[PDB]
Amino acid sequence: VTLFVALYDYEARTEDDLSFHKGEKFQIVNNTEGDWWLAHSLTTGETGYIPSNYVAPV
């Protein structure tokens, strides 16, 4: 798999997005539905949407 790392902090503003800190890592669950990706945080274990331009491949 290809993990992703947060480049910037992000504060959630909806029910289905994740808040995350710079440096947090994610496993991507789905990225075939646009620039907001369904992701699973390796820190919190939560799953939710993240803005794809806020992460980079590890």
UniProtKB/Swiss-Prot annotation:
Post-translational modification note: Phosphorylated at tyrosine residues, which can be enhanced by NTN1. Palmitoylated.
Tissues showing expression: Isoform 1 is highly expressed in the brain. Isoform 2 is expressed in cells of hemopoietic lineages, especially T-lymphocytes.
Signal sequence interval, chain numbering: none
Locations listed in the record: Cytoplasm; Nucleus; Cell membrane; Perikaryon
Residue span(s) of domain SH3: 1-58
Family: Belongs to the protein kinase superfamily. Tyr protein kinase family. SRC subfamily.
Job of this protein: Non-receptor tyrosine-protein kinase that plays a role in many biological processes including regulation of cell growth and survival, cell adhesion, integrin-mediated signaling, cytoskeletal remodeling, cell motility, immune response and axon guidance. Inactive FYN is phosphorylated on its C-terminal tail within the catalytic domain. Following activation by PKA, the protein subsequently associates with PTK2/FAK1, allowing PTK2/FAK1 phosphorylation, activation and targeting to focal adhesions.
Subunit structure: Interacts (via its SH3 domain) with PIK3R1 and PRMT8. Interacts with FYB1, PAG1, and SH2D1A. Interacts with CD79A (tyrosine-phosphorylated form); the interaction increases FYN activity. Interacts (via SH2 domain) with CSF1R (tyrosine phosphorylated). Interacts with TOM1L1 (phosphorylated form). Interacts with KDR (tyrosine phosphorylated). Interacts (via SH3 domain) with KLHL2 (via N-terminus). Interacts with SH2D1A and SLAMF1. Interacts with ITCH; the interaction phosphorylates ITCH and negatively regulates its activity. Interacts with FASLG. Interacts with RUNX3. Interacts with KIT. (Microbial infection) Interacts (via its SH3 domain) with hepatitis E virus/HEV protein ORF3.
Protein name: Tyrosine-protein kinase Fyn
Origin species: Homo sapiens (Human)
Residues of the full protein shown: 84 to 141 of 537
